[model samples]
Target: ARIREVQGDITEFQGDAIVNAANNYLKLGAGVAGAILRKGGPSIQEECDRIGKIRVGEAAVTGAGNLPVRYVIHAAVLGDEPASLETVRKATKSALEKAVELGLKTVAFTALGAWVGGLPAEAVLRVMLEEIKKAPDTLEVTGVHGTEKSAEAARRALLEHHHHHH
Candidate 1:
């Protein structure tokens, strides 16, 4: 599998799919959700409305609408519930599993729950990379971060993972 960490607008990233940091209701609210809706169009939310109320730590897939990617994997990290490392782990694993299930070769993820869900950057990155490392199939896993701090955290995690594997 190829692992990459990039700091940019995830909605514009070219991939087979991009994972949205979503809520249990699958609503496209602020942060990653808002940006995705703004760029991807309302049809994405129309699909989410049809899917409805995914559990925390679970994920659902939908079309990307007007966005660059073919699909969007919505990972529900939290809603009104509290955030935990285990939740992040489960969400990450579920998202990647969904990507693999779709036969996608390239998938990008934003820092799950690190924005409106309020998890720390380092904690999110650690769980995300761990799940990515354990993915069932070979994929080009890209972590698309919005800030320098979260980008650094992902970069550091990638470095540590590389060292341990070698």
Candidate 2:
């Protein structure tokens, strides 16, 4: 339950697992996908392809290629099919599920639907934090990650959430 926010490239994170902001078809073409593909190598994408099509509200798992991590959770955010706030919510849930299933206590995540889907940064942060706060037992969403601006946005929204709840 120690959810932390960080500003950095998600691919550089070496937590037990990292999440990829993937398309429904799970292509590692560009954006967050590109960084993951380039660092993780083609084998990551190959596993993604073989995993086959996943809905926006779904996710697929793959072994981290050359990257120094245990696993990669391909979270469908923007893709050939439907994607939206609900997609972000479901995708977050799926990624956390994968992490717990793998018995990983620590996981790294990024602005999941922000890159291609143009999902509002605040909205994405809102949903991501919400989901992480309710993470399953023995699983910690250790890093809520992104660039400086991305982390800052999420941090501010967290402030807002605390302000309202308190």
Candidate 3:
């Protein structure tokens, strides 16, 4: 499989990069961002502050600080404005593109656009997993979920994708 789903803390992932579901401001404040800041340290946020605000569908990369990974890809999936499916799709695509551009071998992601972004768990998983399927072979992708519910949803999406293939 091109994409795998797991349940765990993404900040602890020892991969090339982990996708952070971020806001336009890219502040590591709450949710996945807070967990990242607490585990990965303040240096990551410092880099984000330097990068400044990005568009909702854009992505930026930064040094991983104390994280086990080498870099963090901040995908602005949501912001003060309402998050839409198109925003989530663009953010997911941009994150993967950034990882590929950096020549990253392994990249991980959380439940993007599902929690604070206000989309359904299954919907987010479906959109992001579809993007990962089309990702270049040079990259290994994993979607990390914090709960069994989300992980199950991802597995369901993965299964559905498998059967839908021509």
**If scored against the real structure, what TM-score would every candidate get?**
0.91, 0.88, 0.93
Candidate 3 residue 117 C-alpha distance from true site, Å:
2.6
Deviation from native of the Cα of residue 37 in model 3, angstroms: 0.6
Q: Model 2, range 11-34, lDDT digits (tens) per residue?
A: 777768888777788877766668
Model 3 worst lDDT window (10 residues): 112-121
**Which pairs clash (backbone N, Cα, C closer than 3 Å) in model 2?**
none
Of models 2 and 3, which has the larger lDDT? Answer: 3
The RMSD of every model to the true structure, in order and in angstroms, is: 1.9, 2.1, 1.7
Give candidate 3 misplaced runs (Cα > 4 Å).
112-116
Overall lDDT per candidate, in order of appearance: 0.80, 0.75, 0.81
Which segments of model 1 are wrong by more than 4 Å?
A: 112-116
Model 2 reaches what TM-score against the true structure? 0.88
lDDT by residue (tens digit), candidate 1, 1-166: 5678878888889879998777778888877778888899999999999997878889999999888899999877787676677777887788888988898998988764343355666667776777888886568888787877767777888898888887
Clashing pairs in 1: none
Q: Which candidate is the best by lDDT?
A: 3
Instruction: For residue 31, give model 2's deviation from the true position in Å.
Output: 1.5
